[PDB]
C-alpha cells in the first residue's frame, strides 16, 4: 500500500510537504518573428477556429487551452530545430504519462494485527504531462553535485495522511514517457496545464489566494522529480546504488495565461532512511513566478503582451546536451 | 476570529462562573424583530462557547466548570424560538386564517389508519408523478378486520389501566 501523490493538487501548502517527500530545496530565480507564430497559435483557438459546439465555461481548459499548447510546442520544436539540432532528433510525445515509485521514511503501524512493526511508507506519482520532449543524450549540470544550498529542507511533524493524501495499492510503475528499450530515454522539457479545479479564479473565489503560486510549485516539485527520478532508474541507478552524475530536466507550467518556468535537478535517490543517515545530497528545484503571457483579447488582438514570457520558453527550448 | 469560541482566559479553570437569569419568554416579547434577530446570534455565539467547553470537559476527564449555565442558554433560544413563532402564527391567522404553515391533509394510509400526511412541495402536478402515483392512500377492505383487532387491543390496554387505579385507590382507602 502506497500513498498516491498527485502533482496537480488542491491541498493547501502542498509545496512544503512535497519538499519533504522528495528532499528538494526550492530556490526562486533560475540557475522577434516568434511572436507571429505564438500569437497565431493563440488567437487560433480563442478566436479564429470555428467550433460547431457551444463552448461552456467548464470545457475551456480541455478544448481551448490544451489544444493551444500542442499547437504552440509543435511549431516551436520545428522552428528551433535549426537553432538547436537536438530537437530534430528528439521525440515529442503528447499526454503520455509519467510514473515514479519511491519509498521515504518509516512508520510503526499504529493498529491492526501488524501493530508496532516498522513499515516503510511508499509513494507513487502517476502524472500525465501535457506534452514532453525526450532527447537521446543528457543535459548539462546546472550546479555541481554535492552542492551546498544551505536553505534547510522542511520536515512535517505529523502523518502524511493529514494533508489530504490517500493510500491505494495498485501497480508500481516507474516510467519515463516510453518503455525501457527506447533510445530517447532522457528528456529535457516538460509542459503542464492545470485543470479547471485549480484556475486563477477558483482559488480566488475561495480564500486561498496565497496558494495560487503553490499549485504551480507543487506541480513542478512533484512531476519533475517523477520525471528526472524515473530517468535515473532507467540508467540502472536505484535507492542503494545512488546516482553518479546528476539527472536534470526543466518544466513550464501553464494555466491559460500565466506561465511559470521551472528547472529541476535530481541529486539523489537514496531517500530511504537506511540510506539517509550519512547522506548530505539534496535535490534542487528552481522556480519562477507566474507571469501573464498576455493581458486579454479584444476578439482579434492580444492586447497587453509580454514577449519575455516568450523568451523564457525559447530559452528552455534552446539548451542542448553537451 | 476563533477566540470567540472561548470565554475570557481569566475564567479558564475557575470551576465557578457567575452567569444566571435565563431569558424568560415574557422579556423577549417586548423586543423588536430586529433585536430578537440580533439576540439569536448572540446566544449562538455563547452556546457555541459552552459546547466546546463541555466537549473539552469530557476530553480531559474533568467535570464541567459550571454546567448550570448551559441549560440557561438553550431554553433562552427555545423561548426566543417560541416568541418569534408566536408572531408569525399570530399574523398568519390575520393574513390567511389558516394554521399549519406546512400544508397537509388527513389521508388514510394503506393500513386503514388516518394520518396527517404533510405535503412535499413538487414541481409537477400530482397526476404526472412517477413516484407519488406509485403511493397508495386507501383502504383495500382486507384491512378492516385488522383495524378492528387493533381497536380491541387498544381498548383492552385502556381497560386494564383504568382498573388498576381503582384497585390502587381502594387499598389506599383500606389504610386511611
Amino acid at each position: 500500500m502506497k500513498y498516491m501523490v498527485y502533482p496537480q493538487t488542491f491541498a493547501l501548502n502542498a509545496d512544503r510537504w512535497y519538499q519533504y517527500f522528495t528532499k528538494t530545496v526550492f530556490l526562486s530565480g533560475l540557475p522577434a518573428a516568434l511572436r507571429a507564430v505564438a500569437c497565431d497559435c493563440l488567437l487560433q483557438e480563442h478566436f479564429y477556429l470555428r467550433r460547431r459546439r457551444r463552448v461552456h465555461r467548464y470545457e475551456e481548459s480541455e478544448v481551448i487551452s490544451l489544444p493551444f499548447l500542442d499547437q504552440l510546442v509543435s511549431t516551436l520544436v520545428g522552428l528551433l530545430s535549426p537553432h538547436n539540432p537536438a530537437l530534430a532528433a528528439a521525440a515529442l510525445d503528447y499526454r503520455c504519462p509519467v510514473h515514479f515509485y519511491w519509498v521515504r521514511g518509516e512508520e510503526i503501524i499504529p493498529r491492526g494485527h501488524r501493530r508496532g512493526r516498522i513499515d516503510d511508507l511508499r509513494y507513487q506519482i502517476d502524472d500525465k504531462p501535457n506534452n514532453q520532449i525526450r532527447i537521446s543524450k543528457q543535459l548539462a549540470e546546472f550546479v555541481p553535485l554535492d552542492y551546498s544550498v544551505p536553505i534547510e529542507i522542511p520536515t512535517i511533524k505529523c502523518k502524511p495522511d493529514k494533508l489530504p493524501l490517500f493510500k491505494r495499492q495498485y501497480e508500481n510503475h516507474i516510467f519515463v514517457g516510453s518503455k525501457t528499450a527506447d533510445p530517447c530515454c532522457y528528456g529535457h522539457t516538460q509542459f503542464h496545464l492545470l485543470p479547471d479545479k485549480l484556475r486563477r479564479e477558483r482559488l480566488l473565489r475561495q480564500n486561498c489566494a496565497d496558494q495560487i503560486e503553490v499549485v504551480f510549485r507543487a506541480n513542478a516539485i512533484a512531476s519533475l522529480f517523477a520525471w528526472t527520478g524515473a530517468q535515473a532508474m532507467y540508467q540502472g541507478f536505484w535507492s542503494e546504488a545512488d546516482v553518479t552524475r546528476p539527472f536534470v530536466s526543466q518544466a513550464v507550467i501553464t494555466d491559460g495565461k500565466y506561465f511559470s518556468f521551472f528547472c529541476y535537478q535530481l541529486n539523489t535517490l537514496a531517500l530511504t532512511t537506511q540510506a539517509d543517515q550519512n547522506n548530505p545530497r539534496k535535490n534542487i528545484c528552481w522556480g519562477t513566478q507566474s507571469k501573464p503571457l498576455y493581458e486579454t483579447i479584444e476578439d482579434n488582438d492580444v492586447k497587453g503582451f509580454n514577449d519575455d514570457v516568450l523568451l523564457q520558453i525559447v530559452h528552455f527550448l534552446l539548451n542542448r546536451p553537451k | 476570529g476563533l477566540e470567540e469560541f472561548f470565554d475570557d482566559p481569566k475564567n479558564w479553570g475557575q470551576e465557578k462562573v457567575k452567569s444566571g437569569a435565563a431569558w424568560t419568554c415574557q422579556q423577549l416579547r417586548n423586543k423588536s424583530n430586529e433585536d430578537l434577530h440580533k439576540l439569536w446570534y448572540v446566544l449562538l455565539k455563547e452556546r457555541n462557547m459552552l459546547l466546546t467547553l463541555e466537549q473539552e470537559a469530557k476530553r480531559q476527564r474533568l467535570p464541567m466548570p459550571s454546567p448550570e449555565r448551559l441549560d440557561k442558554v438553550v431554553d433562552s433560544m427555545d423561548a426566543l424560538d417560541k416568541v418569534v413563532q408566536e408572531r408569525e402564527d399570530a399574523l398568519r391567522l390575520l393574513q390567511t386564517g389558516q394554521e399549519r404553515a406546512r400544508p397537509g391533509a388527513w389521508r388514510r394510509d394503506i393500513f386503514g389508519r388516518i394520518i396527517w400526511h404533510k405535503f412535499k412541495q413538487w414541481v409537477i402536478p400530482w397526476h404526472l408523478n412517477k413516484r407519488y402515483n406509485r403511493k397508495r392512500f386507501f383502504a383495500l377492505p382486507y384491512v378492516d378486520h385488522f383495524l378492528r383487532l387493533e381497536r380491541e387491543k387498544r381498548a383492552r390496554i385502556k381497560a386494564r389501566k383504568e382498573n388498576l387505579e381503582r384497585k390502587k385507590a381502594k387499598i389506599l382507602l383500606k389504610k386511611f
Binding site: 480564500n207 | 467547553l53 412541495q121 414541481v123
Partner: protein, 111 residues
C-alpha cells in the same frame, strides 16, 4: 438550518436566505496530532461542507480556505441490564484549514 423544510428553487427564484440558524457546532481538540493551520470542529449531521464555510466566514469572520468532512460511526455494542443496545450518537467532523497562514493551535483550558 435543520428540522425544517427548504423552499424549492426552480431556475430563477431568489437566493435562499437563512435567518436564525438552527444548527450549533462545537470546536474540539484533535486527537491525533493534527497539522498546524488545521482546526477541527463537530458539525451536526445535516450540515453541508459549504454550509460550514459560509457559517464561519459569516458569523465568526474566520478566513477559511479548505474544508474536509467525514462521518464518524458511533459504537452500538453497549448493552444494558435489559440486554438491548445503546447507540452513542454518530456525528460529523470538520477539518477546517485557515487561510493566510492564520496558524491556530488549541489552547489549554483547565490550567
Amino acid at each position: 438550518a435543520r428540522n425544517v423544510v427548504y423552499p424549492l428553487y426552480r431556475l430563477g427564484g431568489p437566493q435562499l436566505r437563512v435567518f436564525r440558524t438552527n444548527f450549533f457546532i462545537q470546536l474540539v481538540r484533535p486527537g491525533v496530532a493534527q497539522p498546524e493551520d488545521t482546526v477541527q470542529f463537530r458539525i451536526p449531521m445535516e450540515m453541508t461542507r459549504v454550509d460550514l464555510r459560509n457559517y464561519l466566514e459569516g458569523i465568526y469572520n474566520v478566513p477559511v480556505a479548505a474544508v474536509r468532512t467525514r462521518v464518524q460511526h458511533g459504537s452500538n455494542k453497549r448493552r444494558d441490564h435489559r440486554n438491548v443496545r445503546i447507540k452513542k450518537p454518530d456525528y460529523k467532523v470538520a477539518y477546517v484549514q485557515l487561510a493566510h497562514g492564520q496558524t491556530f493551535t488549541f489552547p489549554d483550558l483547565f490550567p
